[PDB]
Design an enzyme around this catalytic site. Sequence first.
Site, mmCIF file in Angstrom:
data_model
loop_
_atom_site.group_PDB
_atom_site.id
_atom_site.type_symbol
_atom_site.label_atom_id
_atom_site.label_comp_id
_atom_site.label_asym_id
_atom_site.label_seq_id
_atom_site.Cartn_x
_atom_site.Cartn_y
_atom_site.Cartn_z
ATOM 1 N N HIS A 133 0.821 -1.218 0.000
ATOM 2 C CA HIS A 133 0.000 0.000 0.000
ATOM 3 C C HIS A 133 0.855 1.269 0.000
ATOM 4 O O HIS A 133 0.362 2.354 -0.301
ATOM 5 C CB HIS A 133 -0.939 0.044 1.212
ATOM 6 C CG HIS A 133 -2.009 -1.003 1.202
ATOM 7 N ND1 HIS A 133 -2.883 -1.167 0.147
ATOM 8 C CD2 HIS A 133 -2.362 -1.927 2.127
ATOM 9 C CE1 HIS A 133 -3.716 -2.155 0.417
ATOM 10 N NE2 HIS A 133 -3.422 -2.632 1.615
ATOM 11 N N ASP A 171 -2.405 -11.002 -1.891
ATOM 12 C CA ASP A 171 -2.985 -10.357 -0.732
ATOM 13 C C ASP A 171 -4.426 -9.932 -1.080
ATOM 14 O O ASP A 171 -4.711 -9.589 -2.223
ATOM 15 C CB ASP A 171 -2.128 -9.154 -0.325
ATOM 16 C CG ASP A 171 -2.618 -8.492 0.939
ATOM 17 O OD1 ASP A 171 -3.666 -7.810 0.877
ATOM 18 O OD2 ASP A 171 -1.958 -8.658 1.993
ATOM 19 N N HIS A 173 -6.115 -7.370 -0.448
ATOM 20 C CA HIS A 173 -6.233 -5.964 -0.813
ATOM 21 C C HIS A 173 -5.402 -5.650 -2.054
ATOM 22 O O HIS A 173 -4.365 -6.272 -2.291
ATOM 23 C CB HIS A 173 -5.786 -5.066 0.346
ATOM 24 C CG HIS A 173 -6.534 -5.300 1.622
ATOM 25 N ND1 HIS A 173 -6.073 -6.144 2.610
ATOM 26 C CD2 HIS A 173 -7.711 -4.805 2.072
ATOM 27 C CE1 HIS A 173 -6.931 -6.155 3.615
ATOM 28 N NE2 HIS A 173 -7.935 -5.351 3.313
ATOM 29 N N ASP A 264 -4.415 -12.741 3.931
ATOM 30 C CA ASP A 264 -5.669 -12.240 4.468
ATOM 31 C C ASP A 264 -6.845 -12.603 3.561
ATOM 32 O O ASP A 264 -7.974 -12.226 3.835
ATOM 33 C CB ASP A 264 -5.604 -10.724 4.683
ATOM 34 C CG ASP A 264 -4.967 -9.994 3.522
ATOM 35 O OD1 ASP A 264 -4.806 -10.605 2.450
ATOM 36 O OD2 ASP A 264 -4.629 -8.806 3.683
ATOM 37 N N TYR A 304 -3.906 -11.907 9.017
ATOM 38 C CA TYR A 304 -4.077 -11.471 10.405
ATOM 39 C C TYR A 304 -4.571 -12.560 11.345
ATOM 40 O O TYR A 304 -4.536 -12.401 12.564
ATOM 41 C CB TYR A 304 -5.009 -10.255 10.428
ATOM 42 C CG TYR A 304 -4.488 -9.176 9.507
ATOM 43 C CD1 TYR A 304 -3.491 -8.315 9.931
ATOM 44 C CD2 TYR A 304 -4.944 -9.059 8.198
ATOM 45 C CE1 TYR A 304 -2.980 -7.349 9.102
ATOM 46 C CE2 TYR A 304 -4.434 -8.090 7.351
ATOM 47 C CZ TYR A 304 -3.451 -7.237 7.817
ATOM 48 O OH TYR A 304 -2.927 -6.261 7.009
HETATM 49 K K LIG Z 1 -3.658 -8.219 -4.223
HETATM 50 ZN ZN LIG Z 2 -4.132 -7.126 2.908
#
Ligand SMILES: [K+]
Ligand SMILES: [Zn+2]
Length: 353
Positions: A133, A171, A173, A264, A304
Amino acid sequence: PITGLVYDQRMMLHHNMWDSHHPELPQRISRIFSRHEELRLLSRCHRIPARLATEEELALCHSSKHISIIKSSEHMKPRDLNRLGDEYNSIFISNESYTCALLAAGSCFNSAQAILTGQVRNAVAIVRPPGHHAEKDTACGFCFFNTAALTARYAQSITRESLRVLIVDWDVHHGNGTQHIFEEDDSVLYISLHRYEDGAFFPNSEDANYDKVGLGKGRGYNVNIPWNGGKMGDPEYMAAFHHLVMPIAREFAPELVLVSAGFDAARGDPLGGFQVTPEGYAHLTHQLMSLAAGRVLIILEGGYNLTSISESMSMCTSMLLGDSPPSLTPLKTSATVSINNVLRAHAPFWSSL
Ligand SMILES: [K+]
Ligand SMILES: [Zn+2]
Ligand SMILES: [K+]
Ligand code: NA
């Protein structure tokens, strides 16, 4: 065929001093490590030393302004750290955060160097804080510096500028930082799979949509595979690799594969809400090993559920080590629409589709 593993407990120092239960726990990396010990995976690996990234290396992807600010956090008192952290989207900062961010990136540098110089075939990096990120000029979503992006640039720095690097981001996100750093770049192929929900899932941007294929010379070399309503699992991800990730990767012919390996999307993770099993991740890993002469670095991002991520990442290390893949329903209609959307979007750039 040797597998490298890098882990340092000093990365545990980074913490949230106002909430010791914050999901980005120090114990994420220590629990993954212990599970590698327990399953006798660690003893099979070549232990790669961790190191601090230099400021000159941070400058491969980040502005000096961003570097200076985060660096200055090392000498801040708790409330100033609180205020600075609040200037970012979803960031907490401790006195040790800057140093832990350095170790995360430096560890990945050493792993990349090991792979590219032939000391090991592949490698796993149990690191924190995460990176994908993080942007050129900002920190975001538990990330300070973009470890994966930096490693791509570092790898090219110690080889040649046009070294073809594939970054696969599984991931849950979208790695907005990674997409933006390389958006105009055709030497780094960024492929992300992520929960999107029409732009209503962190980091809440339409940048994560399938239609974002890259800019200029970088057109075609950004592949977003967005998931919409709702829970997705092994079938969806396997199908995504079959139709999109692996056909595109083969045509790109990478020389190095970096995995932004958050876990995650794993079953049991509160922040992801998906059900990718540990056997799922093994198969994704195994498929990627068919690329780039097996030159693959697995870099921990999110994830997590301490038990879920320890088991999941262990499963990947097992694959890199050369163990046979474990034994694994039709797709959700929405997932099929997602995959057709990406297929149609990348038809002009990839003749293999
Ligand atoms: K991703
Ligand atoms: Zn993530
Ligand atoms: K790119
Ligand atoms: Na292309």
